[PDB]
Design a protein around this ligand. Structure first.
Ligand SMILES: CN1CCN(c2ccccc2CNc2ccc(C(N)=O)cn2)CC1
Ligand SMILES: CN1CCN(c2ccccc2CNc2ccc(C(N)=O)cn2)CC1
Lengths: 236, 236
């Protein structure tokens, strides 16, 4: 299932970071992921290609100018055809988590609008945007890194591109590293013991680092047992 | 206060997205922010510049090879000199928020280690890493976008580069947009009424979208009043 993502950004060249490198770069080269960018600067008509404008009511900051942004969005929507969801990345949006990534990945077409300055006119959110999303409770200089982050996350769900708990520890060569050894179970070749060890480690690490994540899970019988074991060993 | 950030990454060219564009690009050109990258591939000695290795205990994935990564980290630490904090970006890390960004921004030097494949040997976390951080509860193909996100966030705190509530709505030209008008208060020129309107909007939007954020604040007398007003109007 091909995925198409339209991007609206004053800095389209930033997106080379995902389209030219790594797993996402491969997805693009192999036509599994298409990323198409429109720059509001290209939709300006004045001599200096003005893309910002003053906020009504005053204030220190600027907003994105409505007309070039609106025209870029409309062009992206035309190219997308039917069924594209338009996403605005902002701190006031729905907070992204893996469940949310899974939801967004169900779309074959997305348009991502990247805000700069103090953001965009509220009426454009009403008239052009379908959903607002945040990548976390922190503040950035633009919506491009959030857009790139979202693209990377949803790209993992495209066929051919590649449980709620934190990952277990992993080990590779050498057998001894600054005096630290590899857990003997991992060298035992006993697949079941190894699986159970990894699962128990994941449960232990989730409990110690992010206990609230556990509360949101319905643990299996096996997970309940291994978690109890890990907690017992912790209190020993 | 200059900030220096060392980066360890198999894809250093991704960081052009922050060093060549926008506010962070300006910070770099003006020597307010320095971003220096080391690529583990450059620290390999075999003919094919191998940077991955097999996990003990088996499994579908690979890990970053220890020796080239360790040598890159040591080189970065040497260049940083005294006082650099080494950060590993991973989903099992402390979840980043703006308070956390503020904490990390207090450092004049940071080294950011970007994991690929299934991540890095656990013993390297013990021996080389000071802190693990996550940019959110979702899964990406590498630590580069998280590293870039962190750089952008902390760069906003560097002098010369540029309250817990969501932002108010903002408006710019035109006065009427698809029939939608600008709130008359914003056209009134009454600075105090405008300030109070913006604050009330911020409180209202935070309450409606992210009520848990409010619980973590000690609201001022004025904020308590405007929030009560907004809630009263909502229930009217
Ligand atoms: C000082 N303000 C500048 C403009 N801004 C803003 C506002 C609206 C849209 C885009 C931006 C660009 N910034 C972003 C974007 C997303 C995130 C996220 N968490 O997903 C963090 N930051 C908010 C901050
Ligand atoms: C399937 N695994 C591949 C390897 N991995 C991993 C593990 C450890 C370090 C880096 C990575 C790179 N991925 C990241 C990194 C950070 C975040 C974040 N939320 O800050 C999300 N993803 C976890 C997922």
């Amino acid at each position: 299932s091909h995925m198409w993502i339209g991007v609206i950004s004053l800095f389209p060249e930033m997106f080379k970071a995902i389209t030219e490198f790594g797993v996402t770069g491969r997805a693009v080269k192999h036509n599994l992921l298409k990323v198409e960018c429109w720059n509001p600067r290209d939709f300006t008509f004045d001599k200096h290609k003005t893309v910002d404008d003053r906020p009504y009511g005053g204030g220190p900051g600027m907003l994105m100018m409505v007309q070039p942004l609106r025209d870029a969005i409309h062009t992206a929507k035309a190219a997308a055809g039917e069924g594209a969801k338009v996403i605005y990345l902002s701190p006031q949006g729905r907070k992204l988590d893996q469940g949310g990534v899974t939801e967004l990945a169900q779309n074959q077409k997305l348009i991502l609008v990247c805000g700069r300055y103090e953001g965009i006119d509220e009426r454009l959110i009403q008239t052009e945007i379908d959903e607002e999303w945040s990548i976390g409770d922190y503040v950035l200089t633009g919506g491009e890194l959030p857009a790139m982050t979202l693209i990377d996350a949803v790209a993992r769900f495209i066929p051919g591109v590649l449980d709620g708990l934190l990952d277990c520890p992993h080990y590779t060569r050498p057998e001894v590293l600054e005096g630290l050894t590899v857990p003997p179970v991992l060298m035992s070749g006993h697949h079941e013991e190894i699986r159970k060890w990894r699962l128990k480690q994941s449960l232990q690490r989730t409990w110690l680092r992010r206990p609230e994540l556990l509360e949101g899970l319905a643990l299996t019988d096996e997970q309940r047992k291994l978690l109890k074991e890990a907690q017992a060993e912790h209190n020993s």
